[PDB]
Amino acid sequence: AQNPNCNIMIFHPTKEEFNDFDKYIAYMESQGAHRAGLAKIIPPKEWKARETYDNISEILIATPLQQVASGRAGVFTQYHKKKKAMTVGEYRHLANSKKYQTPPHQNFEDLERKYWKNRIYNSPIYGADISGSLFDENTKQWNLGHLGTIQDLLEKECGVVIEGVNTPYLYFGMWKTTFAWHTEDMDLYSINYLHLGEPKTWYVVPPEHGQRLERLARELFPGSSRGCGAFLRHKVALISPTVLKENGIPFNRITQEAGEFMVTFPYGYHAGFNHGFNCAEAINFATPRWIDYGKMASQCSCGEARVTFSMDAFVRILQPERYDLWKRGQD
Ligand SMILES: O=C(O)CNC(=O)C(=O)O
Numbered sequence: 001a002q003n004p005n006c007n008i009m010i011f012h013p014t015k016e017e018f019n020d021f022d023k024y025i026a027y028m029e030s031q032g033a034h035r036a037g038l039a040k041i042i043p044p045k046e047w048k049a050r051e052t053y054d055n056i057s058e059i060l061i062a063t064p065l066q067q068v069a070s071g072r073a074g075v076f077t078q079y080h081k082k083k084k085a086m087t088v089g090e091y092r093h094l095a096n097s098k099k100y101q102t103p104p105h106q107n108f109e110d111l112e113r114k115y116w117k118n119r120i121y122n123s124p125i126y127g128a129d130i131s132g133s134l135f136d137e138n139t140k141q142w143n144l145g146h147l148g149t150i151q152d153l154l155e156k157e158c159g160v161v162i163e164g165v166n167t168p169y170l171y172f173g174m175w176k177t178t179f180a181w182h183t184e185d186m187d188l189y190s191i192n193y194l195h196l197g198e199p200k201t202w203y204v205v206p207p208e209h210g211q212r213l214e215r216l217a218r219e220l221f222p223g224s225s226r227g228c229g230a231f232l233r234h235k236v237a238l239i240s241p242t243v244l245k246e247n248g249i250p251f252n253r254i255t256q257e258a259g260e261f262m263v264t265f266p267y268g269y270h271a272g273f274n275h276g277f278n279c280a281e282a283i284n285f286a287t288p289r290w291i292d293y294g295k296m297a298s299q300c301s302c303g304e305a306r307v308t309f310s311m312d313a314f315v316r317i318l319q320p321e322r323y324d325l326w327k328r329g330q331d
Pocket residue numbers: 171178179190191192264270280282283
């Protein structure tokens with residue numbers, strides 16, 4: 001069995017190996033990369049996402065989100081307070097202001113320590129979930145707006161034709177902006193490219209151990225757990241590495257830098273934070289190996305998780321027994 005300790009693997013494809021996206025994912029899995037839940041892909045030196053980032057300041061962040069925490073430093077939830085619209089140039093200036101800027105630090109480890117000590121005492125503002133792309137249309141390799149769609153994968157594997165679309169999303173971050181513990185919708189893959197700026201630190205639980213994380217989360221968030229049998233789908237709970245280690249939960253960590261891709265694999269729980277002003281692009285995708293995970297994915301039916309249009313068909317076809325309850329949660 002390849003990668004039996006479930007370590008995060010780092011890949012360096014050549015320019016030739018960068019041509020066929022599906023083939024390279026399958027190669028990484030042949031080497032056991034999925035067992036970690038997360039892999040890093042460093043593009044060949046010949047590749048570029050676009051020519052420059054000099055002209056992005058006029059993108060609008062229609063609904064910036066202020067991430068307000070509650071709890072203790074290692075075990076907290078966050079809620080998202082909506083703020084007035086602002087441009088990427090305005091958001092960059094805000095990220096760099098004395099109130100929000102990254103503190104002085106020695107190295108990534110010192111900054112990680114400072115994050116976990118102090119996150120709860122601040123409320124950073126995240127420009128998340130913005131439909132759009134920063135890949136040049138002429139970039140033919142690993143262009144996250146030109147991937148094979150999940151609807152086409154389902155149709156190729158299962159024969160059923162379904163409605164829905166699959167487009168990328170931009171994330172503009174600042175120091176301490178936080179992504180809570182989650183798997184993807186329908187336990188899909190994700191791919192994330194860090195276009196510019198400061199790093200993103202990731203934490204991940206191997207898919208084979210995801211239920212250990214779920215059981216801890218039920219213990220640590222007991223009111224939330226009573227409210228919903230899949231409350232991690234709400235994407236609000238944080239648990240620190242120190243608390244994970246105290247409770248014996250297997251996990252790994254890695255820091256993504258500008259120019260690097262990360263892939264999350266089906267049912268790989270992940271969480272993390274941004275080091276300073278940055279911009280990432282991400283999208284969900286599927287492969288043949290996903291189908292069995294989609295069929296078994298948990299679902300939130302309490303009303304909180306509310307998701308895209310395109311998840312309807314995935315539930316309807318892969319999980320017909322759950323469909324009626326889940327759709328009530330949507331309505
Ligand atoms: O970058 C973020 O805020 C969150 N991203 C993801 O969870 C992802 O790419 O799967």
